[PDB]
């Protein structure tokens with residue numbers, strides 16, 4: 001079958017905390033980074049809603065060395 005890195009690897013999510021106003025590190029939202037190939041990249045899919053407190057839904061985009069992408073939903077806990 002056709003298998004990109006995104007087919008091969010299975011990133012898992014975890015909660016991210018951040019203070020209001022502060023954009024957190026999307027890599028922090030991947031629980032099992034050690035399972036993924038060297039130099040795997042992490043980005044937010046969308047601008048995190050960090051201007052006020054709340055449980056903000058976000059998505060970590062995992063971009064593998066072959067250019068394929070996985071998406072991992074997480075909650076950003078934004079607190080003052």
Ligand SMILES: [Cu+2]
Pocket residue numbers: 001002003
């Ligand atoms: Cu195959």
Ligand SMILES: [Cu+2]
Pocket residue numbers: 053079080
């Ligand atoms: Cu608070």
Ligand code: NA
Pocket residue numbers: 005006007008009010011070
């Ligand atoms: Na995957």
